[PDB]
Design an enzyme around this catalytic site. Structure first.
Site, PDB file in Angstrom:
ATOM      1  N   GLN A 126      -0.738   1.400   0.874  1.00  0.00           N
ATOM      2  CA  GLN A 126      -0.255   2.406  -0.026  1.00  0.00           C
ATOM      3  C   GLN A 126       0.572   1.803  -1.186  1.00  0.00           C
ATOM      4  O   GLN A 126       1.407   0.919  -0.992  1.00  0.00           O
ATOM      5  CB  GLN A 126       0.595   3.474   0.700  1.00  0.00           C
TER       6      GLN A 126
ATOM      7  N   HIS B  26       2.966   2.540  -4.950  1.00  0.00           N
ATOM      8  CA  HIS B  26       3.811   3.309  -5.818  1.00  0.00           C
ATOM      9  C   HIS B  26       3.184   3.352  -7.219  1.00  0.00           C
ATOM     10  O   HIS B  26       2.656   2.318  -7.670  1.00  0.00           O
ATOM     11  CB  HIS B  26       5.130   2.597  -6.026  1.00  0.00           C
TER      12      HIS B  26
ATOM     13  N   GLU C 206       1.727   7.014  -4.266  1.00  0.00           N
ATOM     14  CA  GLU C 206       2.973   7.757  -4.233  1.00  0.00           C
ATOM     15  C   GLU C 206       3.588   7.646  -5.652  1.00  0.00           C
ATOM     16  O   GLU C 206       3.639   6.518  -6.162  1.00  0.00           O
ATOM     17  CB  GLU C 206       4.024   7.203  -3.316  1.00  0.00           C
TER      18      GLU C 206
ATOM     19  N   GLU D 200       5.500  12.232   2.595  1.00  0.00           N
ATOM     20  CA  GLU D 200       5.797  11.081   3.445  1.00  0.00           C
ATOM     21  C   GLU D 200       7.290  11.006   3.517  1.00  0.00           C
ATOM     22  O   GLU D 200       7.729  10.812   4.635  1.00  0.00           O
ATOM     23  CB  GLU D 200       5.216   9.770   2.923  1.00  0.00           C
TER      24      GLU D 200
ATOM     25  N   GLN E 105       7.230   6.431   8.156  1.00  0.00           N
ATOM     26  CA  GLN E 105       7.405   5.381   7.170  1.00  0.00           C
ATOM     27  C   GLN E 105       8.716   4.741   7.614  1.00  0.00           C
ATOM     28  O   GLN E 105       9.733   5.441   7.651  1.00  0.00           O
ATOM     29  CB  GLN E 105       7.367   5.760   5.719  1.00  0.00           C
TER      30      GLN E 105
ATOM     31  N   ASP F  21       8.146  -2.224   0.543  1.00  0.00           N
ATOM     32  CA  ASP F  21       8.009  -1.358  -0.618  1.00  0.00           C
ATOM     33  C   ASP F  21       9.278  -1.436  -1.429  1.00  0.00           C
ATOM     34  O   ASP F  21       9.338  -0.800  -2.472  1.00  0.00           O
ATOM     35  CB  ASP F  21       7.728   0.095  -0.199  1.00  0.00           C
TER      36      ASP F  21
ATOM     37  N   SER G  49       4.214   0.457   2.679  1.00  0.00           N
ATOM     38  CA  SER G  49       4.128   1.897   2.311  1.00  0.00           C
ATOM     39  C   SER G  49       4.594   1.995   0.853  1.00  0.00           C
ATOM     40  O   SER G  49       5.648   2.552   0.596  1.00  0.00           O
ATOM     41  CB  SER G  49       4.969   2.652   3.301  1.00  0.00           C
TER      42      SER G  49
HETATM   43  K     K Z   1       6.095   5.069   0.336  1.00  0.00           K
END
Ligand code: K
Ligand code: B12
Ligand code: B12
Ligand code: K
Lengths: 179, 551, 137, 551, 137, 179
Positions: free
Chosen positions: D141, D143, D170, D221, D296, D335, D362
């Site tokens: 995943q 950003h 995200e 999330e 997460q 992240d 994440s």
């Molecule tokens: K995230």
């Protein structure tokens, strides 16, 4: 092309010579070292530096091995002074001498990418001095930590290539140059 | 017409690295090549008659050497019929004891053990590595060189390197004739930082053995073996010559180990269409077969070959696991530059650092990489602070410790002085007080006054020529008032008489205490057993510089 | 006869360790080095110690180690200079067969170095076959 | 004085980091604190009366939620009596199946499982992680954010991200009123990139759920839970409010997860004297107890707290392993920035990278970190080529692939045009044609034309205030001739109707096939079994830019 | 009802996923969206589908998930902004006991949300005990 | 010091004043933000930017929580315009208004190390602009990816500090600044 083979090299009878030995594809199948410095100008500057110190330059081709130490040892054998310079197509260079173990030497240039035309000239010159039994200061150590990251894989490829022209039992050939 | 994101990406140091597509015919393939031999052994009347598909009529010198001394012929046929996936499971299974596996891996052929290890991923390999490691405590070795072959700087870097926790240290020479100076300065500086640290000087083979015959080194490592017959020949040796060589070192009481490393044979021109990893396994078996206790491998100087290609860094980890699974000391490389990126290099180190090996690197650069005469290590002296923080972050014993500036300056000064006395005592080209002071505060050779090297070379060669030996170093240190370094130098020479530091993984820690795999047995059985960072060691590792107390 | 419980010899059995001129570990002192009661000729590992080590190795399950240690035990008799000489002769293209068998023959009865004479002797046949003798380049 | 060695060391980036000495009283200690509770459980009349030394009389809201919903009470007594070292052994043993362990870990109390994983080292945790991971295939995943909430840049970057291989993306907002715009840009860009990517916009809770009610989001999330009661209250929530929220998103067919992270309680002021991991263990059990499918964690936004102390990065890995051991999806942080040093950040990543988790990061920043509105990730868009070569080096699937510029520019272009048409249909502030171009070739916000924020803001609020729902966006794409993005959008909503993507670890791969832990069951049984990088995906991974053909 | 072997529903039994209007996944064409013959109010997951996911969750050993799914099935009938209203009342210090207990009677009587009504009542008793009601700040 | 407690601040005085809600240690056990900027200059500059817009500014201390969102919420209820500004001792600053969920807001400055006195004055202005009901341009986004690396641990410690002076059940006291 400018290196003609003029028959099997013989032992030098006067000691005012330095033998330059190149590998089996030097100036042939390869044309330039590992950063594109043409073989012609390498040889031209190496000879010049020898010539400058009042010494004679004799060039042969070695076939029996592509290892630069063994190429040199063949030259340190036929050389009137018992001094040789060994050179691989990719540009690796050693200053050898009779009686020395093969993987020993007087001076070694083990990261070819750092050699310039100036350096090569210096190598000719230092060889000639050793030939007249002086003790010239070693050519200054060139060392870059990113030389292997950048060029080892290329170096191994160029060497594999040159290693195809290796001929077991062939004696060195004397070369006539065309500078 | 230009994407700026891609423009920013092209400037990335990683895009300077050398990357090659797989070239299978020339052996430019790290592992798992279609051309590699399928495992087989045929044993007629107690003599190997077929070895991984090759008939005895076709053996090369490497096959003969391996077929006669490198394989347990007794379980060979049995272990050959076992499933390679099951054997791989047993390697990383925490509950299958190291002592139950070693009987099996030593009965394997080279192709057999490569087959088992290739079913693994890196995480399984590190899980196997922590168990198979011969010595229980991990350790480390550093390079201490400099582009001028400067003796005073070499002793200063050696002393600090030993104070930081390196247990072994290696020097080498820009100019070959300087060697004896390098060696002596390495040995004196190492003993000042920490008595027991072992020193080597890496040269042409006969030159190095003579040096050691003179008593100026404690061990040798770069005794090279090669995985095809032509490459071994261009390396000026056979397995019998290396074998004889190994037993000569031991006849002088000196610890030694072989050095191999994936990619050698591609780099030296004859891979015989075989993967780097298979050819490396012949090396590991040469070592085993010669009776040598240990091996420096992990690609070493040729790390550019296997890094160029897919699965190269995993193949590095696998060659180390095989070494250790064959019950050899593993000095697992991490000692040579292969990349312009800090992310890529860190990933490559962590493969051995996280599990622990007998020496996590075999040559962390104790000087800045510009001074490194092995053409750069994978870590250098500016990385020290980083290596310590990752210790602290992960609770991993990476062999080194945080140190204070005031301590290093002192120890660097004592070593320059001790060497000052030695040079005086031996009538060598002197070491000025100015020199000693430079050496103390230097980072690298840039910070050091010039030397007359022509003179230095002249006396260096006299050491060989007149056979001047290590007791002259001892005498010179006692007469200069370095009686303590004299005693320490005497005590390490005394280790060559008892033979205890000849066994698997031996180092000399502490109070003259030999610490090898015979008395520091790796007993790993999973969580909470085997080697665990804790105690003072963990305390030492926690205390980095900058840890602020929440006021 | 020694086992892993006898290892390390200098912590457990230091009295077992003697030098080639029958010196003791405790004879190697700063003074005795200074006064020259002890010499570099004195500090040389004995064949007995290597054979102890070999049996400790064999007990630790490391048989090839022990073999190497037995070859080494022989080579202690052989002089430094001659070790160097025998090492270069074994390098590719250095020797003829006969010079190889002559070294073997010299190691059997000058120095009584029967495992290492058989070693050269093996190399010599194999160098013939694998063509690593003088003239084979 | 001043050693030049230490001056070079002193400039290293690593010494810019924040390092703290352990401060046990304020909970500044990552794991294995002396103050942590010892595991206990007393069950009377089917109700938990003692949890980990605490009596039910003293429970807080967290204890009540965990005691009633979070622990399997049938086996709880049996499991508590089991030896924690044997249980840690089972976790890493390749031969003890995930399905034999889940029945036990879901019967343990928070303190018990903490005790278990604390016996392990990182290598053991990693070998455990690859077996306990719920989904067999690892994912990633990103950003997608920028410092000016520019909707056109967001869309474009969302598209490149989706093309690079992220399966969830995200966004969030510098200016909260921009949210509707950032959500639509993300969804539109992502689907242009790869149909099926899942998109989320992270906000205040009521705000964010209304945005999912409106249809501009496919999952959420950052549904916060916290590990002490004071902190939870400053998070403006309880266990019961978070549990209601969770079943509310499910009531509208939206996949969601909670978010926790070691160090959140120290950061927010009330750690109650407890280690970070223990406190985090209470958060994982709130999630389990709510019935939420996934989590997460891995410190997330508070990574500066555990990183500052000893054993903090190992604590991060262990909180991921508790997570997965409890049979929850793990979106494993990687992240947020914690360090100026590339070495240190790489070692932290490799902890989840090597074993593979449900979402290795994440939140990899799919934009330069200057543009990262979570204050920077551990990896960003300048690291793409590094991340790709390490995949290739280790043969590790890290979820991304090398891409060509040509392909990227085109998809960033199409994303931008598709977004321009949407702002048309809805009658939003015009996205110019020069704007489209800028976003096609941008690297970041620096390369984009400035906008009228204040007008943008008024119309973004309009979306909410007039309840403009995702159908407006769908219809508005067909008008523009993005009948594909319109259907692909409709295709998401069809997945909302089925509910398959609500189960543990679900993602939508390919053309709408959900890949969750129900149908992509991790079956790891050691070497050669479980997930293996191979076939066409391995090929994909070796074909990095700059690989030269050796001839 | 469903087990893990019926999962993915989209894949194994798409015909178990349908509307009250009786539509299927099949007419979620962009066409019928655009012909305004499929609407927003048709694209809302039903309590029946959530209950099928709940049985699959329970069959895969994920009981707590299944419970969450069951509650969600209840909440599909509660109006959006009403869902928002209940969530905020559940937040710290927003509500009094009687409000919460009123919310649970609404959930129970009007929407027949038997599990959530009990969930809210349990919350209401404990926010008393742990002081999370209006005026406790 | 520079701030004295008058007593319980009270609701609207009229719709031309901004409230500045401050945490319990501001000007007190903490006198500078996370990177040394002293509170007095901070306050001084935010007063200024408000007053500058022709709006009056009240200045309250909250004790109910250390959280900036709940500090500002305390301020915004008590305010004639609807707008408040909450500031922690470490410097984290939000512009809130009544009607908003507590953890939503008008403007948020979530990287305290990046705030300068120049920035603080713009926060004040914008606030009053918000109270006057106009639509200010949002104070431009500051974002440094190494702010957390440098300052998160110190932020945690500094918030832990402030949080010790939080008082359950205490209503905000009104203050008068020194200047
Ligand atoms: K995230
Ligand atoms: C790679 C390397 C190796 C490789 C490759 C050798 C090869 N022939 O392909 C391996 C490990 C196999 C090797 C072996 C040896 N090496 Co080496 N090697 C290097 C290293 C670490 C880096 C060179 C490099 O990558 N340059 C970058 C590329 C792009 O340049 P290149 O010109 O194409 O480099 C070639 C030369 O360096 C050549 N070469 C490498 N080593 C040697 C050694 C000698 C004596 C000769 C003539 C040539 C040579 O190999 C490189 C690859 O073709 C250097 C360190 C340094 N300061 O450079 C030590 C170095 C050059 N090696 C050295 C030594 C001593 C040896 C050995 C003699 C060791 C031994 N135990 O036998 C053997 C010689 C075997 C042989 N036939 O060359 C010394 C030489 C000292 C001197 N003469 O003054 C160095 C300087 C330092 C050291 N101690 O390791 N080496
Ligand atoms: C650390 C972090 C957190 C941590 C710490 C919060 C805290 N109160 O301690 C955690 C994960 C717990 C958190 C939670 C939330 N946060 Co947050 N947070 C961040 C982050 C990633 C970095 C801040 C930082 O470390 N800066 C450096 C340190 C040294 O500066 P500092 O001034 O001391 O930073 C403090 C402020 O950031 C404060 N804070 C953090 N988040 C928020 C959110 C709000 C609404 C407020 C008023 C304050 C605040 O916490 C920091 C520690 O004290 C930022 C991203 C960014 N662009 O800055 C998001 C960010 C600020 N958070 C945000 C969000 C939405 C929230 C939540 C509302 C999420 C939720 N599901 O509830 C909650 C609010 C809870 C609360 N009481 O604050 C948004 C705000 C968007 C906006 N309003 O415009 C941001 C911009 C981006 C994001 N989505 O994560 N957060
Ligand atoms: K080494």
């Amino acid at each position: 092309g400018f290196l003609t083979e003029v028959g099997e090299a013989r032992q030098g009878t006067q000691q005012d010579e330095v033998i330059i030995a190149v590998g089996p594809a030097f100036g042939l199948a390869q044309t330039v070292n590992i950063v594109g410095i043409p073989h012609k100008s390498i040889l031209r500057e190496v000879i010049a530096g020898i010539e400058e110190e009042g010494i004679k330059a004799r060039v042969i081709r070695c076939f029996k091995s592509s290892d630069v130490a063994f190429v040199a040892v063949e030259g340190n054998r036929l050389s009137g002074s018992g001094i040789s310079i060994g050179i691989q197509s990719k540009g690796t260079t050693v200053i050898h001498q009779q009686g020395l173990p093969p993987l020993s030497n007087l001076e070694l240039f083990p990261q070819a990418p750092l050699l310039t035309l100036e350096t090569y000239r210096q190598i000719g010159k230092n060889a000639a001095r050793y030939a007249k039994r002086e003790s010239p200061q070693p050519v200054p150590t060139l060392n870059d930590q990113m030389a292997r990251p950048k060029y080892q894989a290329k170096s191994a490829i160029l060497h594999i290539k040159e290693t195809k022209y290796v001929v077991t039992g062939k004696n060195p050939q004397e070369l006539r140059v065309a500078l | 017409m230009r994407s700026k994101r891609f423009e920013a990406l092209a400037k990335r140091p990683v895009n300077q690295d050398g990357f090659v597509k797989e070239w299978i015919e020339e052996g430019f393939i790290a592992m798992e090549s279609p051309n590699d031999p399928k495992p087989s052994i045929k044993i007629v009347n107690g003599a190997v008659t077929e070895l991984d598909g090759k008939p005895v009529s076709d053996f090369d010198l490497i096959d003969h050497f391996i077929a006669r001394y490198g394989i347990n012929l007794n379980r060979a046929e049995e272990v050959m019929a076992m499933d390679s996936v099951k054997l791989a499971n047993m390697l990383c299974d925490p509950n299958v004891k190291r002592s139950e596996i070693v009987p099996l891996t030593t009965a394997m052929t080279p192709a057999k053990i490569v087959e088992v290890v290739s079913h693994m991923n890196v995480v399984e390999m590190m899980m196997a590595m922590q168990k198979m490691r011969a010595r229980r405590t991990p350790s480390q070795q550093a390079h201490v060189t400099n582009v001028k072959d400067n003796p005073v700087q070499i002793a200063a870097d050696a002393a600090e390197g030993a104070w930081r926790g390196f247990d072994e240290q290696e020097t080498t020479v820009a100019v070959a004739r300087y060697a004896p100076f390098n060696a002596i300065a390495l040995l004196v500086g190492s003993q000042v930082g920490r008595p027991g640290v072992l020193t080597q000087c890496s040269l042409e083979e006969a030159t190095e053995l003579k040096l050691g015959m003179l008593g100026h080194t404690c061990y040798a490592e770069t005794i090279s073996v090669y995985g095809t017959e032509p490459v071994f020949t261009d390396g000026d040796d056979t397995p019998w010559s290396k074998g004889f060589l190994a037993s000569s070192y031991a006849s002088r009481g000196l610890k030694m180990r072989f050095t191999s490393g994936s990619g050698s044979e591609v780099q030296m021109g004859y891979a015989e269409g075989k993967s780097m990893l298979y050819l490396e396994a012949r090396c590991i078996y040469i070592t085993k077969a010669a009776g040598v206790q240990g091996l420096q491998n992990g690609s070493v100087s040729c790390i550019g070959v296997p890094s160029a290609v897919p699965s190269g860094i995993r193949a590095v980890l696998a060659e180390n696991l095989i070494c250790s699974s064959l019950d050899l000391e593993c000095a697992s490389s991490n000692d040579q530059t292969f990349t312009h990126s800090d992310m890529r290099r860190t990933a490559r180190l962590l493969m051995q650092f996280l599990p622990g090996t007998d020496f996590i690197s075999s040559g962390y650069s104790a000087v800045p990489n510009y001074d490194n005469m092995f053409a750069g290590s994978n870590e250098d002296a500016e990385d020290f602070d980083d290596y310590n923080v990752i210790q602290r972050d992960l609770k991993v014993d990476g062999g080194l410790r945080p140190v204070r500036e005031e301590d290093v300056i002192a120890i660097r000064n004592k070593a320059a002085r001790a060497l000052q006395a030695v040079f005086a005592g031996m009538g060598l080209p002197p070491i000025t007080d100015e020199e000693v002071e430079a050496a103390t505060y230097a980072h690298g050779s840039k910070d050091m006054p010039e030397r007359n090297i022509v003179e230095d070379i002249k006396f260096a060669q006299e050491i060989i020529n007149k056979n001047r030996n290590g007791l002259e170093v001892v005498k010179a240190l006692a007469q200069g008032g370095f009686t303590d370094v004299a005693q320490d130098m005497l005590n390490i020479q005394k280790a060559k008489l008892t033979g205890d530091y000849l066994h698997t993984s031996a180092i000399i820690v502490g109070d003259g205490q030999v610490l090898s795999a015979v008395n520091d047995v790796n007993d790993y059985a999973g969580p909470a057993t085997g080697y665990r960072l804790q105690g003072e060691r963990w305390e030492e590792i926690k205390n980095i510089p900058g840890a602020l107390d929440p006021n | 006869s020694a086992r892993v419980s006898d290892y390390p010899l200098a912590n457990k059995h230091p009295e077992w360790v003697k030098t080639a001129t029958n010196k003791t570990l405790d004879d190697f002192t700063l003074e005795n080095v200074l006064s020259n009661k002890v010499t570099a000729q004195d500090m040389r590992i004995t064949p007995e110690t290597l054979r102890l080590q070999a049996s400790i190795a064999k007990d630790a399950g490391r048989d090839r180690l022990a073999m190497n240690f037995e070859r080494a035990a022989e080579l202690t008799a052989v002089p430094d200079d001659r070790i160097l000489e025998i090492y270069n002769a074994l390098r590719p293209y250095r020797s003829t067969k006969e010079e190889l068998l002559a070294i073997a023959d010299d190691l059997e009865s000058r120095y009584q170095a029967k495992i290492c004479a058989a070693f050269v002797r093996e190399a010599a046949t194999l160098y013939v076959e694998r063509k690593k003798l003088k003239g084979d380049d």
